[PDB]
Amino acid sequence: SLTRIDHIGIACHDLDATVEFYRATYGFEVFHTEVNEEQGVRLAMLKINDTSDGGASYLQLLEPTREDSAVGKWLAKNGEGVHHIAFGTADVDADAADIRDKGVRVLYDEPRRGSMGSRITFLHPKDCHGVLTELVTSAAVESP
Amino acid sequence: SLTRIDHIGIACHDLDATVEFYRATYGFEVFHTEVNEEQGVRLAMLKINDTSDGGASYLQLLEPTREDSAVGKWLAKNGEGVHHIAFGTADVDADAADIRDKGVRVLYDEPRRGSMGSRITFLHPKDCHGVLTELVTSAAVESP
């Protein structure tokens, strides 16, 4: 089951400037930063709240590491803004299989590595009324 | 202080079809529906989780009631997808004043009526790295 909003994926040209904007404006601090070479991003997670399923909700700020990447292509076409939304689950493999069986395109056969060791997959935005939709299971199993 | 992600504002051409998509695909049910004539939307709130500040996190699906509206103009230009993100606070008036004092454009002098009697304001997307950003205080005061 999808039990939380895990994060909002926000594309930006300059991660350090955008991180500072969120700190200065709202007082949101950096929970974690990393580079995901497979996905072609440098990201920062800003934790906003904890959630009733034992997880948390973050802003995920993403700058591209290369133009030939999902985020690099999208920023070139659309400029900075919301790129995707992510829902959390205790079993991304099972939820992804159930959604595949409804005819929504699941982009990965098998979940891939995401932020902080998470396992992630995506649903095609053209099957989700224009919203690129991520499904994520956190690496650290959570206590509701 | 902004203590939660309150909702993701998602624009759609047909609220009833998009509501059914989220029910059929993810099992998300309608928490509330209403029309906000001032804003020019028909909306559905789908509750995803509760939050650690005593609030909740929703998907807010929005269809325009008129073409000459924020959402009607945006859908005409961009098609269906994420339109805004909303952060919750126990004091939208005070948080809005503090953010006004940083030179970010606050669109309302005084918060306006939003979903389920909430009080809302917006920050200009061009001052927030391309993200239309809502600040909301729920009508029902919340217990962390």
Ligand SMILES: CC(C(=O)SCCNC(=O)CCNC(=O)[C@H](O)C(C)(C)COP(=O)(O)OP(=O)(O)OC[C@H]1O[C@@H](n2cnc3c(N)ncnc32)[C@H](O)[C@@H]1OP(=O)(O)O)=[N+]([O-])[O-]
């Ligand atoms: C590390 C991590 C992350 O979140 S990494 C985030 C970056 N990674 C991802 O986004 C991977 C999944 N996304 C993708 O593989 C691709 O972006 C998509 C789904 C395949 C689309 O790639 P395409 O190369 O096909 O892009 P393309 O520009 O060709 O566009 C194909 C169609 O998809 C639409 N589209 C593309 N990106 C979109 C987006 N982010 N939201 C909505 N619509 C989108 C686009 O406008 C076009 O619609 P149109 O036909 O009406 O013009 N984490 O831990 O959470």
Ligand SMILES: CC(C(=O)SCCNC(=O)CCNC(=O)[C@H](O)C(C)(C)COP(=O)(O)OP(=O)(O)OC[C@H]1O[C@@H](n2cnc3c(N)ncnc32)[C@H](O)[C@@H]1OP(=O)(O)O)=[N+]([O-])[O-]
């Ligand atoms: C009931 C409720 C709701 O949430 S009601 C949701 C609908 N209401 C709202 O969105 C009200 C606040 N928004 C607005 O007043 C307006 O949409 C905005 C901020 C003023 C923009 O209105 P404008 O008429 O100026 O739109 P316009 O197309 O002229 O565009 C002005 C600039 O803003 C950009 N823009 C407009 N809407 C945008 C959006 N949703 N996200 C990001 N950028 C946006 C747009 O692309 C353009 O950038 P560019 O210069 O790079 O081209 N609730 O309870 O939570």
Ligand SMILES: [Cl-]
């Ligand atoms: Cl890596």
Ligand SMILES: [Cl-]
């Ligand atoms: Cl009304």
Ligand SMILES: [Co+2]
């Ligand atoms: Co993500």
Ligand SMILES: [Co+2]
């Ligand atoms: Co809203």
Ligand SMILES: [N+]
């Ligand atoms: N740029």
Ligand SMILES: [N+]
């Ligand atoms: N349409």
